[PDB]
Write an enzyme that holds these catalytic residues in place. Structure first.
Site, PDB file in Angstrom:
ATOM      1  N   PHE A   1       4.257  -1.825   3.187  1.00 48.61           N
ATOM      2  CA  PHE A   1       3.703  -0.374   3.169  1.00 48.61           C
ATOM      3  C   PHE A   1       4.852   0.473   2.641  1.00 48.61           C
ATOM      4  CE2 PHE A   1      -0.562  -1.130   5.001  1.00 48.61           C
ATOM      5  CZ  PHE A   1      -0.076  -2.284   5.663  1.00 48.61           C
ATOM      6  N   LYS A   2       4.666   1.383   1.838  1.00 50.86           N
ATOM      7  CA  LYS A   2       5.635   2.562   1.558  1.00 50.86           C
ATOM      8  C   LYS A   2       4.886   3.792   2.310  1.00 50.86           C
ATOM      9  CE  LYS A   2       7.689   4.999  -2.336  1.00 50.86           C
ATOM     10  NZ  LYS A   2       7.350   5.549  -4.019  1.00 50.86           N
ATOM     11  N   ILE A   3       5.516   4.201   3.359  1.00 51.66           N
ATOM     12  CA  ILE A   3       5.033   5.397   3.971  1.00 51.66           C
ATOM     13  C   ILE A   3       6.136   6.531   3.672  1.00 51.66           C
ATOM     14  CG2 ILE A   3       4.369   6.429   6.233  1.00 51.66           C
ATOM     15  CD1 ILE A   3       2.706   3.795   5.454  1.00 51.66           C
TER      16      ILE A   3
ATOM     17  N   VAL B   1       0.838  -1.179  -0.187  1.00 48.24           N
ATOM     18  CA  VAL B   1      -0.127   0.161   0.019  1.00 48.24           C
ATOM     19  C   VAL B   1       0.983   0.985   0.001  1.00 48.24           C
ATOM     20  CG1 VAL B   1      -1.706   1.330   1.188  1.00 48.24           C
ATOM     21  CG2 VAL B   1      -1.812  -1.239   1.103  1.00 48.24           C
TER      22      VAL B   1
ATOM     23  N   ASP C   1       1.391   4.996   0.610  1.00 48.80           N
ATOM     24  CA  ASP C   1       0.792   6.088   1.256  1.00 48.80           C
ATOM     25  C   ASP C   1       1.538   7.506   1.105  1.00 48.80           C
ATOM     26  OD1 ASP C   1      -0.445   7.715   3.498  1.00 48.80           O
ATOM     27  OD2 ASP C   1       1.163   7.361   4.823  1.00 48.80           O
TER      28      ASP C   1
END
Lengths: 304, 304, 303, 303
Positions: free
Chosen positions: C165-167, C137, C139
């Site tokens: 997750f790529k924050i 996901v 972000d």
């Protein structure tokens, strides 16, 4: 059951042509709005050009208007500030001057300074702790702050004074539906705003009050009266007749609508905004008055 | 040539844990920042939490800081307000208290109230008409307002007091390049900001001043000194050494950076912001101090 | 424990000076990025100028790059689309072409088209239903969409393929802390992005992977290796030395950084973006190369 | 003098219950909109849910709709893309399939990818160079891109095919006034949009065309006819009668308004959007139909 319902129009701030407060015109504007049938008044909101006035002027206007209203109708004083302590102090001062309610946006500044939900809750809780009059939470695009219906309902349930809501973000009707469902009897005032542009949809959703422009509350109030009485066809017919004027206010003449009408009517001495807010284009003003004259609002036949 | 150049850090506003102004710590912060070598100071800016204070507090802080500085360095007083007349009055008051310069964002409010170019020009022109000291135009994301380089250059050429610019929007270096190309000698102060995060690129572009955070002007100022003297490699080496601290300020600890460092060093009594601004995460604070202790900044060894 | 960790740089899309895809240069860029030590690659992301290419070009590039990698390193294929069915179809196609993982932004369009949380959940649930490889996901500010740490953790716990997750929204380090805490063992890959500009803070927060620019993964990877090995001071030293270049990429040369370096080094034939993306200012480019030369990255001595 | 004027409603994209394109319903929607008296049609705009379809679907829809129109009315094909060369290729293909005009937003992507004025000018100049039909510049909030009236007028004066404008940002009437003043007879089509919510004010400002929703062009068109004939009171009366329905479309039912009406009337088989776009709230839909039935629109008495 609710302490307040009906139409609570926003009082415009009346300036002299050179920018100082015009308190004589301010009092006439208030008297006209009460004579037009307002159930109450809201002062120092965005349609009052609150961002253009000083703290000292805010206090003068609050004192002047509350004293002149003299208890005839309830007054909601808008007290928004980024600082919790500043908002709480403004709200307590408004209460001591006679306010029936305060309205506050969530804390924000400009395009970029925003506050997490947890601290917004604390903001309203601390303002509530400081006062004994109800709080109206303003949900409006100007704050650039998302206030979900579950969060708004939680504040109403858990914070003593949070009881009223001015829902003016897109999709307000279905947000009002959800706010009422989640908040129950804690939602004392599910109200709408935005000059009544979505009033018909919002009444279907359960709205019980409307915060409108100040120029023609006499035109809008019978919609709310018809709705509460079950006269839905009468409400539609009145909405249809006044919608071109509501739409011109919402989209064309904006904040300055009420002042342009009041000036044309001789209620106030000057319709000017404070610089640098742009003045009305002469065609926008002419078209405003042309629509208004079809409807014969009180504002053009009050001072005469 | 210019009246002012060099490093002009933003003075943080010091509060008690309760949220009241702490004017004792406020004066100590000023003294530390002057001892750190600042060429001047900037007060009541966004890194000063200006959005969280009242008009009365603004006047108390302006009078207190200018009196304490006692002419040791020039002070830029930030005077932004939506109203032209309010901004002009604040700017005149700052001048009367001893300000060298005022800084003003273009007029704006919140997420949605914006002002057209023509009225922004008039805003600055009228503020200029009121005062004898120069104006710094602040070009920053918080205003949500686009000020193109041609427009900024036109204001410098055509408005007497407009002479300084704090460029902190994205791509500031190439905006500074274009501002200087289009404005020529009228651009007295092409300056940057944003805690010095893009200082190296901005110096290449021709910036002559830097409005940084208040925690370590002693770390940053030798970069500007070296650049001016043509010691470009000394500037780069110092930039590389301090960039991790600049980067932590810009991305992690933000506004509260200077106050966290000052509190750790015993310069100020409390590092708290005004509620509802969130406090520093404990890991963010610990990592801030860990980076700072690699660099032996004056703020952690200020023995006064 | 996790299937994937380390540095996964974004592969730039290489165009001819004429704007057409330059597949010869594309393959050389991939080979250079693998030689630079990349643990994996990410294709068709925003640093790949994905918004400037067509669906047909997306498929050509996915097939060409996956075949050229030839299993040497895992490839994350970015498959974002507003439509759930279109994203699911792209993701299944990517899987069938050999992708190890897909990356998807939440559904959005432009400045104004947004999707409520409940439908974002259904979007990822349906993409997960269609495929057998993990979802990352993304972000990121480009979507204009809020994805809270609790919502992201709920998606990891309740949706089978949601695991990475790529924050890269502001305050990513403290969001990563909360996401890792709330999600527990469902958070296989708490990763960061934004060209590694916040990598030191994000490593302190528990990040296990980094999606960086493609120009110098050899400069950045030892930061992650040092961190993993407990050599925190060595990690700081490497971060500090490379941070002026990371900062120039993040703030000055941007998406075109990797291509400007690859063109200077002779890896690719043209550094041009697809019009209308602005070309680099000449001083911005000169300053980029001046910083890079000081750090001696592989890209300037590969070809 | 203008080649095109009057009402050009946006054609909705009709999906099957499965989410696949429903081209049979698509053709029926076109026939209804023509029967309702549309002066022309606009396809593949944001009110057509264009962000939810693929490139292949865009080409199928362009071919299908143009062939079905069979020259009955002119068609504006929306061809927006970030890439100049992709937009130009789409626009040339639209021309070859019979389009009368193309409409393009300025290049943008998402919340954060924006293009400077200089490159926006080049974008439109190069699209113009590629085609022999006029360009409509779309000035709309979804692009998040400021297009000043002086800049729009400059493009109209300096770029051959730039001649039409869909102004639907806030204050469109004042902007149209300034565009007309600054552009002169280079402004062939100063048009408005946004479902006709500001149509009366925009007509006062000089608008010669309106790009509305597709559900009731028969309700709106007499406003434009009366205005052009100098029957300004007749225009107001018709506007006032239909404004509650325009307002409900603008604020409540939105994009799906036309499809809900067409489905209720038997024009199309399914009114669904593509997932994840929210479906119509049942009260919003019931209220839409209640207002519509007061006005006896053709869409409810066509099939």
């Amino acid at each position: 059951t609710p302490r307040h319902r009906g139409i609570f129009p926003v009082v415009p701030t009346t300036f002299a042509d050179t920018g100082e407060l015009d308190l004589a015109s301010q009092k006439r504007a208030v008297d006209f709005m009460i004579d037009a049938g307002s159930d109450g008044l809201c002062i120092l909101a965005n349609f009052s050009e609150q961002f253009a006035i000083t703290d000292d002027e805010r206090d003068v206007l609050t004192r002047t208007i509350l004293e002149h209203v003299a208890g005839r109708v309830p007054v909601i004083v808008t007290t928004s500030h980024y600082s919790t302590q500043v908002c709480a102090a403004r709200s307590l001062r408004a209460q001591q001057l006679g306010a029936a309610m305060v309205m506050a946006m969530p804390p924000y500044h400009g395009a970029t300074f925003r506050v997490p939900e947890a601290q917004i809750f604390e903001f309203y809780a601390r303002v509530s702790d400081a006062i004994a009059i109800p709080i109206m939470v303003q949900d409006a695009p100007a704050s650039g702050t998302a206030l979900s219906a579950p969060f708004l309902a939680r504040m109403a349930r858990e914070i003593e004074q949070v009881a009223y809501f001015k829902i003016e973000t897109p999709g307000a009707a279905n947000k009002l539906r959800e706010l009422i469902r989640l908040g129950g009897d804690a939602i004392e005032g599910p109200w709408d705003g935005e000059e009544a542009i979505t009033l018909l949809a919002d009444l279907h959703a359960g709205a019980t009050g409307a915060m409108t422009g100040g120029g023609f509350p006499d035109g809008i109030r019978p919609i709310l009266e018809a709705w509460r009485e079950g006269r839905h066809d009468d409400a539609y017919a009145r909405y249809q007749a006044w919608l071109p004027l509501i739409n011109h206010e919402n989209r064309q003449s904006g904040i300055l609508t009420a002042k342009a009408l009041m000036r044309e009517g001789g209620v106030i001495a000057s319709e000017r905004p404070r610089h640098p807010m742009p003045e009305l284009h002469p065609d926008t003003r002419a078209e405003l008055l042309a629509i208004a004259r079809r409807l014969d609002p009180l504002v053009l036949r009050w001072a005469h």
